[PDB]
Amino acid sequence: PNSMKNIESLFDYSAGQFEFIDHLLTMGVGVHFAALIFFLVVSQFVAPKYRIATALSCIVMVSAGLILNSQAVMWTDAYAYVDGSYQLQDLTFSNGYRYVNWMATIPCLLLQLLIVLNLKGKELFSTATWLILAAWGMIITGYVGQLYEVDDIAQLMIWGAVSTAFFVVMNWIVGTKIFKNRATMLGGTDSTITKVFWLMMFAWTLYPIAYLVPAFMNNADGVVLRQLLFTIADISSKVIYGLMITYIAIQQSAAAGYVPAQQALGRIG
């Protein structure tokens, strides 16, 4: 469906290119589901006030892990080694599935940030609402632009400019809440949370770069570079981010007198 609308469908792949992409996606699966088990076992050391932030990391791990797994199977479904190269056999592969999955996972990432920022009640609800509307705005327009990466690069860029507006506004909300709520942060995660902001600015900006590959490297090695960028960005924005969020959750839990958190941190001291 969308498979002919993505540049991956344009090329044959060397075994090297093809298998590297397969292994990137597969490694990504392993990393997300390994991290899942960690988030799972560690959630008992998080106080009830924050426990949802760690649960959201579990959910994101399986959601992203399942899309990466799906992408890897679809990749190997779409191509067969015929006459010295991997050649397209059918329309099973598309990056579009990622975009659709972001509809779920980006709101999860954002909500876990709001929780460890100690937002609650009306502010939590309204902040979350505006954030995920801005995120949905960004994702949807990006998803549309992405359908044009083969036959209309101008349209890719204009949808991307629109998507970037949403992105920039979302980042402004994120950053503003982070920097205005630093003072509430316990133990003293007020320092840690600013690192989380920069990680997000870094990791999330890789996705617009991946998005633009069809405009500056429209060949089989650009296909590889795009999956590499997605891979770097996924483990940064999801796994490393998640670990920091959970660190902040446990640390604030301990500072607030949750004994299992104290015992946990103590037994790694």
Ligand SMILES: */C=C/C(C)=C/C=C/C(C)=C/C=C1/C(C)=CCCC1(C)C
């Ligand atoms: C784990 C997923 C996650 C953090 C995804 C991030 C998506 C993101 C920030 C994409 C943003 C853009 C953009 C700014 C312009 C081009 C389109 C798109 C959707 C790649």
Ligand SMILES: CCCCCCCC/C=C\CCCCCCCC(=O)O
């Ligand atoms: C922060 C997450 C890091 C993600 C790790 C990615 C693992 C691979 C790292 C770089 C290897 C580069 C070697 C690629 C050789 C290209 C083979 C080919 O395309 O022909």
Ligand SMILES: [Cl-]
């Ligand atoms: Cl609590």
Ligand SMILES: [Cl-]
């Ligand atoms: Cl995802």
Ligand SMILES: [Cl-]
């Ligand atoms: Cl300090």
